Amino acid sequence: NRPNRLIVDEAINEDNSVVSLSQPKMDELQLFRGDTVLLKGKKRREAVCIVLSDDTCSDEKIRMNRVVRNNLRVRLGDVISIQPCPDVKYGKRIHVLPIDDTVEGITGNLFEVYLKPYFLEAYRPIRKGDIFLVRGGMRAVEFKVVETDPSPYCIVAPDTVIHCEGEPIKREDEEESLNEVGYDDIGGCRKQLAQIKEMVELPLRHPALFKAIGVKPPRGILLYGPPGTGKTLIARAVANETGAFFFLINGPEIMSKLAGESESNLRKAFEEAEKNAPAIIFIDELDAIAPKREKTHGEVERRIVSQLLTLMDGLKQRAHVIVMAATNRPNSIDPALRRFGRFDREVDIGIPDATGRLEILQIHTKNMKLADDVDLEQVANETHGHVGADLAALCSEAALQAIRKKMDLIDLEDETIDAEVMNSLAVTMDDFRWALSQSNPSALRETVVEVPQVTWEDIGGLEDVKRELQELVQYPVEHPDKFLKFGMTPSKGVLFYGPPGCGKTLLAKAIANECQANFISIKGPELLTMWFGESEANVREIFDKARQAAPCVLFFDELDSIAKARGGNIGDGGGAADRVINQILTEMDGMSTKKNVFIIGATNRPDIIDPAILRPGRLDQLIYIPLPDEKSRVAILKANLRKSPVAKDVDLEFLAKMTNGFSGADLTEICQRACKLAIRESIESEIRRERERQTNPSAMEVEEDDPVPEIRRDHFEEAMRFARRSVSDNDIRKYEMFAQTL
Amino acid sequence: LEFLAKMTNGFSGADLTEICQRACKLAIRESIESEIRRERERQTNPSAMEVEEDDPVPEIRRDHFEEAMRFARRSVSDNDIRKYEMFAQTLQQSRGFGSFRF
Structure with a gap:
């Protein structure tokens, strides 16, 4: 059909019960008097209402009726097109079971009252499955059979009221049992949900495609990644929308122990679905029943893993009843992915972003009135890194706490809890935010969802540094043909000068966060002075890490510290040192040439770290990312003093110069050091004042928040005199000249 | 290429x-997509030029190559390598014999 979707407004007819059949229904199709436009629904649902229509009188282009829309669960503006539907069955005779809920709670014989209105004025044709309006329960009737041995399509007479099974339906049928908090815009990930739906459909509705492709032994979908979250309970509202198949309900599996019987029934189910069309019924307690090399170092966990491997390598692409994301424990998942089915493909899981939080907030607002002016944008921003089950759970807890506080403050609510009082005492956006701050998400930290040790603005200046980073990001994505026709991408490796703590790691993390990348923030003597021998060992370790986490920007900062000046040319120690130096040269002369391995080293001198690479010998282009020169020390000290207690006169320029x-x-x-000295002075002054007050009730007091509430410029100058300047002026000029001449 | 060889x-x-x-890097940095497109940055026009430049090599002239070469060392120890090759050749000549064909 059309690629752009729309929304269907209300019916043109004012009366909802007057659902006039369209002229096209009787024109394009031979719509007789006893049949109307049959509406297709989800999970193999179809309903047609016998209503006489006059196409020659008035062809009203009205939309669907409200009752019809609710019964068919038709999406707003869905493309109403006739396509091949191979999942429709037929029957001859059925048993129209009555609603069990109407039988209970009704005074006297409820069957007599039900049959009184069933024969005449029942608002239901002669067929099974007709729902009737009942008083009480406040729930819908929409049940899906996971795997029913019998067929669901058969005609039933209305004059015979067939008895039901006697079991009332307490569960809310319209809702979904799983994914209670794990709900996002498309159920976590749009791509993952689409892939799951495609796997469920094509393997079950297009077996010819699999046969021509020839992947019979393929199991299906056994995903991982999102383990432990509400994505563990993400089966319903995704499979509930997708529905379930029939036949091959299950094995007996009733011994309550199932020592080897658990494996036997699992193998039987895995083999049975390979030649059947059963649904992918999610394994209840999948990790509990299958330890999957995670629970015990004995036999149960390894046996579970092996059985999972056999099932993934022993089931056809027809059911693929495999738990996704959190199938087994994240530490040791089942071998359903290790065997056929997920051994070559990953899961397109969506990250926890403000989209999932906003979707959860919308779902909660639809479920209950959060506030009159609830700032859902503020809620999403406060829980941007935490989206899914954690976000929805935290929001629900915050709303409950705010509503409870509002109800308690409004009155005691111990004699007549007014519903208007509770609804009006909605969980205020500020109150909900405060309760959520008092609460926490499932994750240990909501800020751990991104790779950012320092902000881009935290790294002061870095104008040419940010320019080089942006050029690397762009020319590889913008003009990769420019690089290709120009040859190779530029070499990496920067050489900073001055003292340590230059912010090279901080600036790299700032760029990686601005590039949404997890830079491999390497240490100093951790690549060259490798602990596993020569530098080649740590070089290969970093190569493996970058290849498994591309792009992992191997920020091998402090090349002067990286070398660590091992030395020791005596006996085998000299051999080890020479091997380390040669291995460092080899790594600088060919390593993992991907994942943007940029080593921003420290250049204490021209030969302090790798003079050959300092010369244009090893690095064809020693690309040092220049930074704008700022009094970043002054700004950092100002931020620290703001975090502490220094104020009033601060000759910061006069001292920093x-x-x-x-x-x-x-x-x-x-x-x-100056802050510590000032704090010590303040503590000493406080102690002296306290001693004076103890000696005499009115002797002394506290001058201010500190003995020197202003900048301890005297203490700062005293510390500076006790310490020494970082470098001399002649040495600084020589270093600047050496840097410029290179 | 003849000028480069000379x-x-x-x-x-x-x-x-x-x-x-080095010349390739100079061309890539001097590339209009790396220079002109960034220069306008779709402020009034998408790139600083209405039409794209040529391949990055065009035109990194003899000036860019000469600057790189002045920066380049190309300073192999001619005396040492010459002595090594000469010693090897002298050994090989001392190693060879005549035709000795009957």
Whole structure:
């Protein structure tokens, strides 16, 4: 049909019960008097109402009726097109079971009252499955059979009221049992849900495609990744919408112990579905029944893993009843992915973003009145990194806490809890936010959903550094043909100068967060001075890490520290040192050439770390990402003092000019020392004042928040005099000249 | 290429590869997609030029290559390698014999 969807408005006819059949229904199709436009529904649902229509009188282009829309569960503006439907059955005689809920709670014989209105004025034709309006229960009747041995399509007479099974339906049929909190815009991931639906359909509705492709031994979908979340309970509202098949209900599996019988029934179900068309019934307690090499180091867990491998390698692509995401424990999942079915493909899982939080908030608002002016954008922003079951659970808890607080503050609510009082005392957006802050998501941290050690603005300046990072991001995505016709991409590796704590790791993390990347923030003497021998060992470890986490920007900062100047040319130690140096040269001369392995080293001198790479020998282009020069030490000290207690007169420019030779963290140490000295002075003054007050009730008091509530400029100058400047002026000029001449 | 060969004067093959890589990097950096498209950045026009530039090599002229070469070393120890090859050749000549065909 059409690729752009629309929404269907209300019916043109004012009366909802007047659902006039369209002229096209009787024109394109031979719509007789006893049949109307048969509406297709979800999970193999179909309903047609016998109503006489006059196409020659008035062809009203009205929309669907409200009752018809509710019964058929027709989407708003769905493309009403006739396509091949191979999942429709037929029958001869059926038993029209009455509603069990209407029988209970009715005074006297409810069957006599039900049959009184069933024969005449029942609003139901002569067929099985007709729902009738009942008083009480406040629930819908829509049940899906996971695997029914019999068929669901058969005609039934209305004059014979057949007895039901006697079991009332307590569960809310319209809703879904699983995915209670794990609900996002498309159920977590649109791509993953689409892939699951396609696997469920094509393997069950297009067996010819599988036969021509020849993948018979393929199991199906056994996903991982989203383990432990409400994605563990993501079976319903995705399979409930997809529905379930019939036949081959289950094995007996009733011994309550099932030592080897659990494996026997599992193998039988795996083999039975390979030649049948049963539904993919999600395994209840899938991790519990199948330890999957996670529970015990004995035989049960390994046996579970092996049985999972056999089932994934022993089931055809017809049912694929495999738990996804959290199938087994995340640490040791079942071998259903290790065997056929997920051994070559991953799951397109959507990350927890503000979209999932907003969808959960919308679902909650539809379910209950959160607030009159609930800031769902604020809720989504506060739980942007946490979306899914955690976000919905936290929002529900916050709303419940806010509503409870509002009800308690409104009155005692111990004699007559007014429904208007509770609904009006909605969970205020501020109150809900406060309760959510008091609450927590399932994840240990909501900020752990991104890779960001430092903000892009936290790294002061970095103008040419950010320029180089953006160029690397773009020319590889913008103009990759420009690089290809131009040859190869530029070499990596920066050489910073000055003191340590230059922010190279911080700037790299800032860029990676701005690039939504997990930069491999490498340490110092952790690649060259490798602990497993020569530098080649750590180089290969980093290569494997970058290949498994591409792009993992191997931020091998502090090349001067990376070398660590091992030395020791005596006996076998000299051999080890020479091997380490040669391995470092080899890694710098060919390594994992992907994942943007940029090593922003520290350049204490021209030969302090790898003079050959410092010369244009190893690096064809020693691309040092220049940063804009700022008094970032002054700004950092200002932020720290704001975090502490220094105010009033602060000759920050007058003092920072004395030692301008800083590398961000260089002057921060002096600031920290001055802050510590000021805090010690304040504590001493407080102790002296307390002693004076103890000696005499009115002797002394506290001057301010600190003995020096302003900047302890005297203490700062005293610390500076006790310490020394970072470098001399002649040495600084020589270093600047050396950097410029290169 | 003839001018490049004449300027090479039998420069080192590794040095030649390094010079080629340096010229390639200079061209890639000097690329209009890396320069002009960023320059306008779709402010009033998508790129600083209405039409794209040529291949990055065009036109990294003899100036860019000469600048790279002045930056390039190409400084193989001619005396040492010459002595090594000469010693090997002298040994090989001392190793050879006549035809000795009956």
